[PDB]
Copies of this chain bind each other. A is one copy, B any other.
Amino acid sequence: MRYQKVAIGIAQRIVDGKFPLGQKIKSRSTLASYFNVSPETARKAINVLADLDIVSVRQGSGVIVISRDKAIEYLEKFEATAGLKEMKQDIQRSLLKQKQELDAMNKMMDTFLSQASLIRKKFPFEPFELLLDHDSANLNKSLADLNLWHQTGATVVALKSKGELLLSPGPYATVRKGDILYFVGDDFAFSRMKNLFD
């Protein structure tokens, strides 16, 4: 209602001290003119403020500002976030935050994966390991039969079986479920060993 909006407006003039505390509003004959409304609109705006004990009003005797504190609190009622449109903008800000966060994460991951890719580059002779714990047609076969290099690019360097590490197992060595294979190669050779025993 316009008359209530005008009450807010009058209360703002109180807070800014344009209608000072303790003084009859000097401009009462013209208070409607200040807000571009009719006299009846301003009169009703005044009654709203009197109910709120921001002013007193007495016919033929003027309007007295009796509390600026209560006007400050009244304006607090309408600055607070309110209404569905604001809650929607709230949710939309969250969506925009997430878009920014995902974009940030994109760069972090790209830098992270690119540099971790380089870890092994200056350690060609650092082995990979592979625990042989899936069933596979390739178990209980000797290295000579397995053609592991042909099929993966890996060179087996060691084997752990029954709790003993066997370096340089050789072609007669048989792999068993539960063994760990150690081998050297590039990152393709790791993936290809993995596929081969899956």
Cβ–Cβ < 8 Å partners of A85 in chain B: 117, 187
B92/A97 in contact, CB under 8 A:
no
Which of the residues B16, B168, B173, B191 comes within 8 Å of A126, measured between beta carbons? B16
Contact A168 B191 (CB under 8 A): no
B108 close to A101 (CB less than 8 A):
no
Residue of B nearest to A115 (CB): B190
Please encode chain A, from 94 to 107, with 1 for each CB lying within 8 Å of some chain B CB and 0 for all others. Answer: 11011101101110
Binds B, one of A23-31, A59-67, A76-84: A76-84
Chain B residues near A125: list those with CB within 8 A: 125-127, 157-158, 167, 182
Whether A115 touches B84, Cβ cut-off 8 Å, given contacts A4-B150, A151-B77, A170-B4, is: yes
A111 to B94, Cβ gap below 8 A? no
Does the CB pair B170–A155 fall under 8 Å?
yes
Whether A168 contacts B190 by the Cβ 8 Å rule is no
Closest-by-CB residue of B relative to A153 is B168
Contact assessment for A142 and B44 in the assembled complex, using a CB-CB cutoff below 8 Å: yes
In whole Å, how far is A59's beta carbon from the nearest beta carbon of chain B? 13
Cβ of A124 within 8 Å of any chain B Cβ, yes or no, is yes
Distance of A184 Cα from B106 Cα, bound (Å):
27
Could you tell me the distance in whole angstroms from the C-beta of A2 to the nearest C-beta in chain B?
10
**A112 and B91 within 8 A (CB):** yes
Could you tell me the distance between the alpha carbons of A50 and B189 in the complex, rounded to whole angstroms? Answer: 21
| Any B CB within 8 A of the CB of A144 | yes
23 A–B pairs (Cβ distance < 8 Å), ordered by A: A47-B171, A47-B172, A68-B122, A77-B195, A78-B192, A80-B192, A83-B115, A84-B112, A86-B191, A87-B112, A91-B112, A94-B104, A98-B98, A99-B99, A102-B102, A115-B191, A118-B119, A118-B120, A124-B167, A125-B127, A153-B170, A155-B157, A168-B184
